[PDB]
């Protein structure tokens, strides 16, 4: 596991262990976006704005439908446990496409209940409606702007007439088109393959997900996961969605640690160890964690899948406490911290930070061969960093550092220019070596001839 | 051209040939955003919110005007075919700036018709208006919120008075400012040089582009191309735009192919060929295609310009079927597919995928020296991958693979850390070689002296 106490000696501050939660399973639910609102004018006044809005929906619903038809790459035994899902198709489908096609053929049995339900949702005015079935969960349908239509436009058609009611529809529906376009328009193939974040659709429709389908961070995670488009009705302008309620389990014996690298001095130049922002353990395992897609709760990270990736370099040996193998890289800017509070004391490179021990006049100098200064409460009662006076914590666990000849031979560059420059220098040295070899071989030929 | 059948043996799945459409020419049209709506209160009630909205427009229109004045870098024979466009200016202008200045001096002849039209648009209340001229196309003007003003605020000034009418104006106009800021505020120099996507302005103003100026994917492409700002009136708060209606032609003898790389096993480790996501042919030519800015129609990619870039590496030889030169790289995560359906069969590396031939109990083992397993319908009737049973397609064209000693010497890294680490190892070996050379040269001196 991580040797946190030794990693501090190179400014690597492994901190904040949090557990990790993974959805072992998903409860599925269906959501039907019925994109056309019903009007009650009894004279087809709103039809003119409905027609142009339909003519806008085409710009999103037809690309979405044409994208979904590519997911018909499993051709259809089925209906039997461990039977054949279907016949492959003449094309190429990657594992992501195959997984999406399998999810579609799992949902395809809904389509007869879809046919049953649309007969209702075609007629109803109610904005959010749920329909029961022989299948366990209720299926819910949202009719896009019905609250606004029945509560505002239905009165306005009488109070203000067809002119204002028509403009109100035009504005509201083209706004709803801009919202739908923000949800459905970008990366359409990925949006079909991987789905749409439930957060966006709920923001479209203020959907009380827990009330519609059934901790704050668990709810945020439920918003972050992607609902898959399972059908798109081009004639009824309806999109059917699979919502995926996660069953979260706390994964045992896992911790995700944050690692912050401060600048490390080598001969009055600033270097740092460019470790990934997060690292994780799984019993004996040690690797990075791509927490970027996860929800950081206060006690655990809720992730859609195990974010761990194995550290390919000596970085694993570095983190395991074999400090001599840590890869150095040069600091570029103020993004790398020059100091940090650690376990009640301070770890900083006092060459580029005015470290003071018991007052702004007593500077804590570090020798040029020491990379970071570890200032425990036993050393200094009131450490001042860049003038900022702080008391060190008397119950701090920051272990005292007897300095040592830590030599970090693994100098590494993050910039392609640096690598190209030093590779050109290596290639020039290699050419010099080849020239020497040619000359010595010629000399060998001459000595042999003689 | 691509040797698709041989590329499969390294998990490179070249697929989905689509043609390519390029706008050989653009029909120009002019659009005048008249940012101030006219009021009809007959008492200047709305003036207070108009003044503050003008005071907001300054935050975008003045930067936009000051940006456009830099495009006055051609100084002004003109008016004669093949005559001098103008005198250069004392500064530096790159080819993009020169192209934008040339486009501005082409549009500059509109400015007398602009002066003629603004006399009308200053007075009219109508939200979208078109004006004819001696030049061929109508020029259209949009007065920002006139529908809302005349249909809602003009009634409200009488029904609710100056107080509510004023608040309605304040809210609507500052919303319109946030929309304008979303369109005009970012990357102002690029926005002047390259223009604004017509999609955004149409979303601002629900503009029926085909109705205003004249297939769904052709319309999407017309939305994706950039309208250039040609004038900005700081006193009238008016922005004049050049809309560019593309004349699309299907380019002959071009195909764009998608390429998906699955993991390829070398000695129980996963590798892949990091080819670009799309490749294109142009007769004998073979290169990549930067389709990111193009519209993917079902039969062709509509691109603003030829996206092709020549493959600088042995990647061209790799794609041409000289498989031994394909560059390997190590897999990093689940983003690289471990298997894919291909032409009715399956191509997968069965070392990290439970491939089964005619039932979940008959695993299709592959020898450690074979990188991918190609499972044709002649081999297996019902291939199961990770438990998922699928029938292979009896009309599939997936050619049967007799395995061979495919050796891929071009090991390549995508991560600067890997390159730096192995360059440091190379440099250390080079230092060892130099030390040996110094020792041998010293020995040569000693033998010569003796």
């Amino acid at each position, epitope marked *: 596991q991580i040797d946190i106490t030794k990693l501090q000696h190179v400014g690597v501050l492994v901190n904040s262990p949090k557990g990790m939660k993974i*959805p*072992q*399973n*998903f*409860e*599925t639910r269906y959501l039907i976006l019925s994109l056309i609102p019903k009007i009650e004018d009894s004279n087809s006044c709103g039809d003119q704005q409905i027609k142009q809005y339909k003519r806008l929906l085409d710009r999103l619903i037809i690309p979405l439908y044409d994208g979904l038809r590519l997911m018909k790459d499993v051709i259809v*035994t*089925e*209906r*039997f*446990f*461990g*039977g*054949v*899902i279907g016949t492959i198709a003449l094309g190429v489908a990657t594992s992501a496409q195959i*997984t999406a096609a*399998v*999810a579609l*053929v*799992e*949902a*395809k*049995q*809904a389509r007869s209940d879809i046919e049953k339900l649309k007969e209702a949702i075609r007629d109803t005015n109610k904005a959010v409606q749920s329909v029961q079935s*022989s*299948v*366990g969960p209720p299926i819910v349908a949202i009719k896009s702007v019905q609250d606004y239509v029945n509560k505002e436009i239905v009165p306005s058609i009488a109070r203000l007439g067809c002119e204002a009611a028509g403009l109100q529809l035009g504005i509201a529906l083209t706004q709803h088109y801009s919202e739908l376009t923000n949800i459905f328009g970008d990366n359409i193939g990925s949006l079909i393959e991987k789905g749409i974040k439930l957060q966006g659709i709920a923001s479209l429709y203020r959907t009380n997900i827990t009330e519609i389908f059934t901790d704050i961070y668990d709810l945020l995670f439920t918003e972050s996961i992607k609902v898959r488009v399972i059908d798109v009705d081009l004639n009824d302008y309806s999109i059917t969605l699979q919502v*995926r309620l996660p*069953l979260l389990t706390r994964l045992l014996n896992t911790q995700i640690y944050k690692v912050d690298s401060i600048s490390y001095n080598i001969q009055n130049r600033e270097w740092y160890i460019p470790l990934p922002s997060h690292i994780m353990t799984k019993g004996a395992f040690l690797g990075g964690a791509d927490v970027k897609e996860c929800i950081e709760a206060p006690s655990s990270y809720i992730c859609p899948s195990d974010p761990g990736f194995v550290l390919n370099h000596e970085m694993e040996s570095c983190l395991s406490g074999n400090i001599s193998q840590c890869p150095r890289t040069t600091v570029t800017s103020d993004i790398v911290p020059r100091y940090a509070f650690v376990n009640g004391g301070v770890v900083a490179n006092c060459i580029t930070t005015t470290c003071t021990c018991n007052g702004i006049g007593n500077r804590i100098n570090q020798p040029p061969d020491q990379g970071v200064k570890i200032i425990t409460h036993k050393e200094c009662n009131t450490i001042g960093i860049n003038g900022m006076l702080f008391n060190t914590n008397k119950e701090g666990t920051l272990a005292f550092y007897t300095p040592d000849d830590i030599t970090l031979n693994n100098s590494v560059a993050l910039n392609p220019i640096d690598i190209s420059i030093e590779l050109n220098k290596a290639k020039s040295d290699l050419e010099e070596v080849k020239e020497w070899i040619r000359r010595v071989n010629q000399k060998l030929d001459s000595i042999g001839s003689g | 051209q691509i040797d698709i059948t041989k590329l499969q043996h390294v998990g490179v799945l070249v697929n989905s040939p689509k043609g390519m459409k390029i706008p050989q020419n653009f029909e120009t049209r002019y659009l005048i955003l008249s940012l101030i709506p006219k009021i009809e209160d007959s008492n200047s009630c709305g003036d207070q919110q108009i003044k503050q909205y003008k005071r907001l427009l300054d935050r975008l229109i003045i930067p936009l005007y000051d940006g456009l004045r830099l495009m006055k870098d051609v100084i002004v024979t003109e008016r004669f075919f093949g005559g001098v466009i103008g005198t250069i200016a004392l500064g530096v202008a790159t080819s993009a700036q020169i192209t934008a200045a040339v486009a501005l001096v082409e549009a500059k002849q509109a400015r007398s018709d602009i002066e003629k039209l603004k006399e009308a648009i200053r007075d009219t209340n109508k939200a979208v208006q078109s004006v004819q001229s001696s030049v061929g196309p109508p020029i259209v003007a949009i007065k920002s919120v006139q529908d809302y003003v005349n249909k809602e605020i003009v009634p409200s000034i009488a029904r609710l008075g100056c107080e509510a009418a004023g608040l309605q104006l304040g809210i609507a106009l500052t919303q319109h400012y946030s929309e304008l800021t979303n369109i005009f505020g970012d990357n102002i120099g690029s926005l002047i040089e390259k223009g604004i996507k017509l999609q955004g302005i149409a979303s601002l103003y629900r503009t029926n582009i085909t109705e205003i100026f004249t297939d769904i994917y052709d319309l999407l492409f017309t939305e994706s191309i950039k309208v250039r700002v040609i004038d900005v009136d700081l006193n009238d708060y008016s922005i004049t735009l050049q809309v560019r209606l593309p004349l699309l032609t299907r380019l002959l003898n071009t195909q764009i192919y998608k390429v998906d790389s699955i993991s390829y096993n070398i000695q129980n480790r996963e590798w892949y060929i990091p080819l670009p996501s799309h490749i294109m042919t142009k007769g004998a030519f073979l290169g990549g295609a930067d389709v990111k800015e193009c519209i993917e129609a079902p039969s062709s990619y509509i691109c603003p310009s030829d996206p092709g870039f020549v493959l600088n590496h042995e990647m061209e030889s790799c794609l041409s079927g000289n498989i031994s030169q394909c560059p390997r790289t190590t897999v990093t995560s689940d983003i690289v597919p471990r298997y894919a359906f291909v032409n009715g069969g399956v191509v997968a590396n069965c070392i990290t995928t439970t491939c089964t031939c005619n039932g*979940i*109990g008959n695993r299709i083992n592959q020898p450690p020296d074979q990188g991918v397993k190609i499972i044709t319908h002649k081999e297996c009737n019902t291939i199961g991958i*990770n*438990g*998922m*049973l699928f029938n292979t397609n009896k009309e599939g064209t997936l050619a049967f693979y007799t395995p061979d000693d495919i050796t891929l010497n071009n090991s390549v890294a995508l991560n600067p850390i890997d390159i730096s680490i192995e360059l440091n190892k190379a440099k250390s070996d080079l230092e060892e070689v130099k030390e040996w050379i110094r020792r041998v040269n010293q020995k040569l001196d000693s033998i010569g002296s003796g």
Partner: nanobody
Amino acid sequence: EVQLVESGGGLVQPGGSLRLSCSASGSLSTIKALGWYRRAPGRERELVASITSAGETNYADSAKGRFTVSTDNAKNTVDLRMNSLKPEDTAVYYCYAESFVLNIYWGQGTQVTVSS
């Protein structure tokens, strides 16, 4: 969607044996595993037994070797055979079907109880 229909529960004498039979229907070709969960009072749903389509079977430490689970794939039924029933085994048993995409489907659950 997978319809799960649990059956065979009720009261039984302690130390007795019982067979719980769940009928599954729908797109079962997409189902990775069929099995049973239990929910005792005051605790979450614990796994009881599961059968993968490959036949591979697993159990919780409370169930290993003690219980046995079976299917009759000709009729899509999954049966859990209960034996040596204890007071500690009383719970609502929930049949489940788990998809390859890790969706989970549940039966209505059957009450299992034992005499005092």
